């Protein structure tokens, strides 16, 4: 039926038997489940074959990142900004990523910086005019 097919809903319930209050959306080629896990917003992307391809945990603050990531962020140019989002991005077959979004002193400008868990910067982008910067197009 609507929003998410039965096998996708079943695949989420298998990963997370206690997930509830789920909100489903569509993100290009994927179904996205949004739900709470232990008080953290969690999103899981499923393809048409009900295989999970990304998960994001909304950490909200730098409090949750590895020290190496905190230190690397603090040492970077981007530390002059206000941290507006911190996301732990996981994948079934690739290394995890800490995605940090900052807003700069003069307001409109937003950057997204992708760190490995040991604090190496792998990519940074001006996302000011990007609609869904943590969406599938960024990572998949």
């Amino acid at each position: 039926g609507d929003w998410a097919p039965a096998d996708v809903q079943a695949a989420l319930k298998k990963m997370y038997p206690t997930a509830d209050g789920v909100a489903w959306s569509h993100d290009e080629s994927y179904y996205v489940a949004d739900f709470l896990m232990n008080g953290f917003d969690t999103k899981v992307w499923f393809d048409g074959q009900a295989q999970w391809v990304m998960q994001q945990t909304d950490w909200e603050t730098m409090d949750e990142v590895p020290p190496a990531v905190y230190n690397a962020f603090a040492a970077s140019e981007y530390s002059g900004g206000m941290v507006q989002n911190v996301t732990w991005v996981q994948f079934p077959k690739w290394q995890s990523i800490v995605a940090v979004e900052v807003g700069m002193a003069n307001l409109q400008t937003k950057y997204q910086i992708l760190f490995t868990p040991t604090g190496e910067i792998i990519r940074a982008r001006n996302v000011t005019y990007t609609y869904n910067p943590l969406g599938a197009a960024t990572f998949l």
Side-chain angles (χ1 to χ4, degrees), residues 65-105:
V65 309
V69 174
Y70 189 98
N71 295 337
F73 172 77
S76 77
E77 315 118 282
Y78 302 103
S79 56
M82 279 73 159
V83 174
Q84 292 174 345
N85 185 92
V86 181
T87 303
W88 181 233
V89 185
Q90 298 175 275
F91 307 102
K93 302 181 188 188
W94 311 334
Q95 189 169 244
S96 297
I97 292 169
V98 185
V100 178
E101 190 160 335
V102 297
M104 306 298 295

Side-chain angles (χ1 to χ4, degrees), residues 10-91:
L12 179 64
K13 194 156 191 274
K14 184 169 155 74
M15 283 170 82
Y16 290 114
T18 69
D20 195 10
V22 180
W24 291 97
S25 64
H26 287 205
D27 180 359
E28 70 193 20
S29 183
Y30 304 100
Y31 301 95
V32 180
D34 181 65
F35 56 96
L36 235 45
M37 194 51 64
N38 260 8
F40 285 87
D41 180 69
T42 307
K43 286 177 174 72
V44 182
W45 278 251
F46 295 87
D47 65 26
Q49 294 187 279
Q51 267 211 245
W52 82 275
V53 298
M54 178 161 66
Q55 173 175 277
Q56 292 179 6
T57 302
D58 186 355
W59 273 337
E60 279 169 45
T61 73
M62 299 291 287
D63 292 3
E64 299 289 345
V65 309
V69 174
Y70 189 98
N71 295 337
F73 172 77
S76 77
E77 315 118 282
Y78 302 103
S79 56
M82 279 73 159
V83 174
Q84 292 174 345
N85 185 92
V86 181
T87 303
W88 181 233
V89 185
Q90 298 175 275
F91 307 102

